[PDB]
Every structure is written in C-alpha cells, then in structure tokens.
Ligand binder design. Sequence first.
Ligand code: DGT
Ligand code: MG
Ligand code: MG
Ligand code: MG
Length: 342
Amino acid sequence: HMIVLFVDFDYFYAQVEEVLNPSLKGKPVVVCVFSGRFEDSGAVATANYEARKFGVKAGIPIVEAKKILPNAVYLPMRKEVYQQVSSRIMNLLREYSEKIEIASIDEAYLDISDKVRDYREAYNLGLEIKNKILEKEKITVTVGISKNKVFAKIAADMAKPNGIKVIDDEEVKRLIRELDIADVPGIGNITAEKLKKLGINKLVDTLSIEFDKLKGMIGEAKAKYLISLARDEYNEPIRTRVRKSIGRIVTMKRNSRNLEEIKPYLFRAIEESYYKLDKRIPKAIHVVAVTEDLDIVSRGRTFPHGISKETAYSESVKLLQKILEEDERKIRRIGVRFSKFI
DNA sequence: GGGGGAAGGATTCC
DNA sequence: ACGAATCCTTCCCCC
Ligand SMILES: Nc1nc2c(ncn2[C@H]2C[C@H](O)[C@@H](COP(=O)(O)OP(=O)(O)OP(=O)(O)O)O2)c(=O)[nH]1
Ligand SMILES: [Mg+2]
Ligand SMILES: [Mg+2]
Ligand SMILES: [Mg+2]
C-alpha cells in the first residue's frame, strides 16, 4: 500500500542565482522577465522570501516590484543555466527510485512503495534526501508525503519553505474535511468561484451534489477528480511525463497590425523555437497571437509528415494572415508553437 | 448514435 | 503586466 514523495525546490530560479553568487544570499532577489518596451518593463518570474515577504511574486509587473522594493536585486530570467542545474538534481532522485515522475522543472514525485515500509522510514528517507541535495548541489527543497501524489504535493505545500511534512492516513480525513478547496491542485480562481456558487467550500461538499450539475459546472474531468479524491479513492500512479509540445512567444517592441513589420518577431520565435526542438520533428504547428488588450487567438495546422524549418516559415504566415483576418484588434505579442512531434 | 480526431479557446501553474 | 498539459466544445467526415 502506497507512499508518494513529492520534492519541490525552494524559490528555484531565485536560488540558482544565489547558489551562483552567495553575495546575493540574505538579499531580496527578483528574477525578472523583460521585453524591451520601456526600461524596466516585464514581469516577475520568482523572488526569494526577502522580497516575497513584502508581496513580490510572479507575474506581477517589474515596476510594482521597485515601487515596493527599489533596493532589491533584479536579474533577468536564465532558463538555460537553471535547466542544467535541475537536471543534475533530477538525476539524483533517479538514484532513489525508477518510479519517478518529473512534473516540472522544480518538482518530481517518487513511488517509494517498495523501498520504505512506512511513514517513519519514509519520512526518514525524506531528511536523507533533503541533505543529499543540500550538500551536493547547494539547493534546499521541501518534501511532502502521503498516499496519493495529490496529497504529497499538498503536504510539502504547507511545510514550506525548507521542510518535510507527512500526512498520515488519518489526516487525509482531517483534510478531506477541513482543507479549503481552492488550496487544491488544479483549482484556480475560475473553478473556485464556480464551486463557491455551487455551494462547495471543501472536498466533501462535492460528495453531496447531483454529479450532472457538477459536470456541466466544472467539467466532468475535474468533477470526477474531486469526487475520487474526496472518497479516499484518488490514485493515479507516478508516470514519466513526455514533452508533448514546444514553443516561443516573444513580445513585439510596439503594438502593430501590418504584416511586414510583424513578420520578423515571428521568424525569431520559430528560430529559437527550432533550436529547442533538437532531434524532434513535429507534425503540427500553431501561431499564437496576444491581442492588444491581452486576449488570445491561435490558428493551427497538422501535416501527414514532419515539418521542416523552410515549411515552418511559410505556414507561419498563412496562419498569421488567417489570424490578422477575422480578429481585427491590434496585435501586441505573437509567436509559434510546435506540437504533434513525429 | 458514436468513433476518430483536428481546431481553437479556456484554465492551472510552474 | 511572462511556457506547457489537460479539459471541453464545436465541427466533421464516414460506417
Ligand atoms: N516566468 C514565470 N515563471 C514562474 C511563474 N511562476 C513560477 N515560476 C517559476 C519560478 C520558479 O523558480 C519555478 C518554480 O516555481 P515554484 O512555484 O515551485 O516556486 P519557487 O521554486 O520559486 O519557490 P517557492 O516553492 O514558490 O517558495 O517556476 C510565473 O508566473 N512566470
Ligand atoms: Mg519550487
Ligand atoms: Mg488552487
Ligand atoms: Mg511548485
């Protein structure tokens, strides 16, 4: 009977910049995402507690970060470097199990059902791993432990930052009971506002509702997931997830609408994009446009054969042309996205 | 009806 | 105000 270990790295990006210059440690760090529209324009990717302490988190404008903390250290995002770093740490969890699911860049799940016998021995294996990474890589994590991936993640969510927490089989009930419902994975404000109205505040509130309204309300899938979870019967296993799509979406230097000028940003997007594909040939391709007021439209197309960079360019025009058509608005951003690899 | 499946908007979250 | 996997919904051609 199953025990899942979820490991998340504390303020990952921000921490990689600290690991690479401890002269930053103890200071408020903000990894920012620029664009080139107006000096210090962009958004916040992540920020260590010092800055996160005073409300500076992700997706929030770079100015609002300064107006709050003018003396904070701001650094552009640098995936490349962060990717290497992670992979290594991710190659170290692979030493603890073959039943491993790498969900993101900062987190993975382990099925230690056959390495440890219980929560003291598992939570034992926890501390061991927090140290085996804190010493070899200079990166602290947070470990969550319960019976299904869903609850493991949650465990760790609480016990943060830098911490290990386990939710025995008893607390699952304390939580299918007490745990708010919007503090659940896959339940962003949209769906929560829905549940609100549905007169649902906790996991259990679903258990007492005519499914069919829950279906049309949130969408059968979420509907079955919430139910199956509230009935201590949720249990999808740890599966190695495969990259299913790739794509870049750069931000133009100024809201536009004539084809010619728009074109180049897009070719750069397909350019970088392709470098990232590497050895991977896709059969699909979309063109994503972010209108002037931040809405979205994207046209696509699938081929019976794998796309070539030379073909990628042609289609990424008939699709931009198709977009610049029925949608009139001015175009703010734009970019390409390749799916359906061969 | 119902399957196979492609298109595009929506929704969560790193 | 800055990538992706899943989910849903319509649209569709052919058995
Ligand atoms: N570009 C961008 N990056 C984000 C956003 N949200 C999160 N990230 C990135 C920054 C983090 O280094 C990486 C992992 O995010 P986490 O939610 O696990 O937080 P982080 O690792 O920063 O520390 P945390 O666990 O949140 O205390 O995801 C976002 O909205 N935009
Ligand atoms: Mg993290
Ligand atoms: Mg939520
Ligand atoms: Mg996370």
